[PDB]
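yo

u said u wanted the structure for the complex thing, so here. seqs first:
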Amino acid sequence: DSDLSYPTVRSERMKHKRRRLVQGPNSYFMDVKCPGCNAITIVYSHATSEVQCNGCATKLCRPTGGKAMLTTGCGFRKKADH
Amino acid sequence: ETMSRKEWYDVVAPKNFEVRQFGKTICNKTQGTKIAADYLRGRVYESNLADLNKTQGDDDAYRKVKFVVQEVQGRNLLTQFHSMEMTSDRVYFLLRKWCTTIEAAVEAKTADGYTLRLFVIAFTKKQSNQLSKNCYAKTRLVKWVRHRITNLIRQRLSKVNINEAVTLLTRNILRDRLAKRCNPIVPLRDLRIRKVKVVRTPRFDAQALLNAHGEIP
Amino acid sequence: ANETKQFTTVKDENRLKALRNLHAKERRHGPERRFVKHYQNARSHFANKA
Amino acid sequence: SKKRGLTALRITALGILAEALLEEDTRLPYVATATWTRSFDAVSRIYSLITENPAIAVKEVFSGDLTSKRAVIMDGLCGLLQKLHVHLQRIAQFKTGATDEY
Amino acid sequence: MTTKRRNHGRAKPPCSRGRTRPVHCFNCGRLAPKDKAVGRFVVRRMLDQASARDVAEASNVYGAGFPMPKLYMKQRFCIACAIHSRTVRARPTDMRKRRFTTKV
Amino acid sequence: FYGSSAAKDELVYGVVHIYASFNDTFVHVTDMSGRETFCKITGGMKVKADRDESSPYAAMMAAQDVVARCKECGINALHVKMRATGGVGTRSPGPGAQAALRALARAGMKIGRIEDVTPIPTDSTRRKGSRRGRR
Amino acid sequence: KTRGCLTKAQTLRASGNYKEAVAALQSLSEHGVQWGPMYIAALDLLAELCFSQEQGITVDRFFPAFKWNRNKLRGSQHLEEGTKRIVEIAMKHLRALGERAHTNAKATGETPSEEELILAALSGVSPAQRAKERYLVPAETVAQFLGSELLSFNAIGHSRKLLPIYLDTATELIKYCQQHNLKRAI
RNA sequence: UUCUUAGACCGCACCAAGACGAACUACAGCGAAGGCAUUCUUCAAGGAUACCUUCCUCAAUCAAGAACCAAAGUGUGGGGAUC
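structre next:
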C-alpha cells in the first residue's frame, strides 16, 4: 500500500504545496457582485490589496491576513481551476 | 517624666465612613510660644479598613486608609483622605507562577484640585477547558488592557469631586465597572486597586472641609 | 438575545411547561393529557456536602 | 466640517459625516434616537447649502454624478435619503408599540 | 573530567541564550546565574500552632475562622548554600535524572 | 495616672512596633500617628551580655515591662506591626518574635490586626559582602 | 458581613447606576450571617423594592432570594417568623405595583393628548381605552410568574408547624386577583 | 575596633542625590556574537508566514583588508548614593 508514484488522497492533501509531486498552486479566482451596481469583477482569493469594484469604487475586499476577506453584503460565486 | 504635660484628643473622619471616630491620640500643652495646636496639623494616621469603617467589610481588612489633619476644632481633629493602600501579605496570595501579570499607573484629576495616581494590577486566567500549561499573553493584548484602564479611571473621576470619589475606591465600585469591560480583551483572574495616592492638593478652605464632615461628634 | 435572558432556566420544570403544552389556538387542543409529576430542585445549602 | 468660515467642502465634509454615522453602530443591531438624528440634521444642513448660495458649486470639483463626491452624488438622486428610510423602518420593525419609544 | 549532567547544571540549552542575569543568595550573598541557582517558595507561618492559640484567644478578630496572616517570600540559594542546609542532596546515578515539575 | 479621660472599660488602641533581628529585639509603642511615643524598651537593656540580646528570654523580659507602663496610660488593646532586619538584610525575622507576641497576649493586652511591614526593595544596589560571599 | 454590603447596594441604587443593587444581593448570600437576621430581612426588602426600570431586574431574577432565605439553621424558634416575613414583603410590594399600574391606566387615557391621540388617530384603529391596557398585560405577567413559583416548595411549607402558613399565602394571592382582572393560572 | 545626654538607636512625616528595576521570570523570547526585563511617546531596522507578484544564476566557502566585542586596565572632563 501507498506506492510513491501513485499516492492516495490523504497522503497528498495534508502536505505543504511544494512537497507534493505536482507543486500546484493553492488558490483560485472568484466573481463578485456589489449592491451598488450591476457588474462582475474577477478577484483573487489571496488578493493582498484593496480592490475597487469594477466600475464603481468602494472596495470588495480588505487585504488582511494570508487570505483576503470580502467586504460585507457583496455576493460571491467561485470559478473553475481548469 | 514627661507624661504630666500630655493632653488627649479624638480623631474624626468624613461622613463617607460610617464610624466617625476611630482613634484617640496624644500631644502636649500649648504652653510656651510653641502652641501645640500647630503640631496637630500635618499629622497622618493609619487605620484598617473595616475597622475605621463598618464593620465587618467583607474580605476587606487588608487595605489601609490614611488621613491627615486639615483643621483642629475643639478637642476633635478633622481630616481628609490622603492615601489608601494594602497589606503586603495579601498581594502574594493572588500572585502565581505560569501566568502573566499586568501593571498600570494612572494619573487622574478630580473636579477639584486633587490629582491622583491609582496603581493597579491584574493577572491572566486559564480557560475552563484549557489543556495547556501556558497562560501567557502577547504584547498588543497587554497594552490594551492598560490603555482601556487609564481612559476609564480618567473619565469617571474627571466629573466626580473629592468625597464623591473616595466612596468608590473604599467600596470597590470601580473594580466592577473595570473588569467587566476588560475581560473579552484577554481573560482576567483578578483586578485590584493596589494603592492610591495624592500628589497635588487644592488650597485650604474652611467650608468645603466642614461640609464634608457634617455634624461633628 | 442572551442579555435579556438569564440563566439556564426554562419556563419551567414542571407544571408551567405542561400548562403551555396543554392547548393551542391553532392545532392540537386542548385539554390533552394531565401530568401528575412536579419537580423542584432543592439540596442542602453547603458547598459540596453537609 | 466648519473649515474656517467657508462652506464649499463643508458640503462634501457634512455629506460623508451623515453617511458614516448612520451606518455604524454595531448593535443591537440598529440605531435609535440620538445617533439617528445626527445624520438627519447633517442632511438638512446639506440641503440648506444646496438651496442657498449654491447652485454654484466650486472648489475641488463638483458634480452630481458619478465618480466621487460621493454622499453628494448619492444625494443627487437621493439614495442617501433612502438609507435614512431603511434605518428608520429597522428601529420600528424590532420594538413593539408600548412605551413612549413609539 | 567528564560531563556529569546533560544540562550542565543549568536551565539553558545551547543556541538559545548567551547570558542570564545574576542574583543574590539568600544566605551569604554569593552570586550565580538565575538558571543555575535553585529556587524555592516558602509560605511560612507567622507564629507556631501553640503560639497562635494564645494570641487568637485575646484577639478580637482572629480565631473566628478568620485566619492569622502568613509571610510569603521566595528564596534563591547558591549550590553550596543549598546542599549545606539540606534543601537538596546527592542522589544515586539513576535517580539523579528525575524531575517533579513545579508541583510540591 | 496620666491615662485617657475618654470612656471607662472600652478599648483604646495603641500601635506596637516589634523589631526582630538576629542581634537585638526592640519593642516600641506609639499612639496611631507615630508622632508620639509611650515606651521604647529594648531586649538588650534587660540582660547584661552581648551574646544574649536577641535570645527569646530577653524579648519576653522587655514585653512584660512595656505593658507594665502602657496600662497606666490607658492603652487596653494594641495593633501590632512586625518587622525584619532590613531591605538588603533578611526577609526572615529574628527569634525575638514568637517571643514578644506570646508575652503581650498573656499580659492582659488585647490584640487585633497583626501585620508584616518590612522593607522589600523593588531593587537595591549591592548587598554587603562580595561575589564569593562570606565563606 | 451584612452591613459592608447593604451599604454597597444603597450606593448602586440611590445614585442610580442601577443593576448594582441586584449584584449586591447576590454577593450578600451567606456566608456569613444567614439567619440572625438580624437584618437579613431588611436586605431582602431592598431587593424586593426594585421593580421596573428595565432589564435587569424585571423581577423574574428574584426567586434565588426566596430559596436562600431559608437559609438554615432553624435550631431556633424563628423559622415560622422568617417564612411569614418573606411572604409579607412580597405581597405588600405586589399590591403596591398593582396600585401604580391601575393609577397610570386610569390617568392618561381619558385624556389623550397630544401623543396618545396621534397614535390612536394614525392608522392605529385603537382607543386609548385599548392602548392603556399595555400597562396591565405586563402587570398580570409579573403577578402570574410570582404566584407560579411562590407556592411551590421552597417556601415551603410542610410540617405540623410549618404547613399552616401555606394556605394564608394562597388566600392573599387569589383574593388580590379577584380585585382586578386576570387569570390563566394559580 | 566603631557611634552616643552636643539625644545615638527606634517611630512618623517630608526633602535631597546617585544607582538599580524584585516577586511575576520559565530546560521561555529576541540578537551575528559579546548581550538584552518599569511605563508611555518616537526614530529607523531584522526574522518567520501568506502569494498563480517580479527578476532569471546573480551562489557556497574563504588567505589579504575592514567592522563589532564581557569584565579589568590607560587618558581628559563630569558624577560619587551603594559596594
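Helices of chain B lie at 88-93, 140-153, 162-171, 173-182, 207-210. Chain B has five helices and eleven strands.
cya
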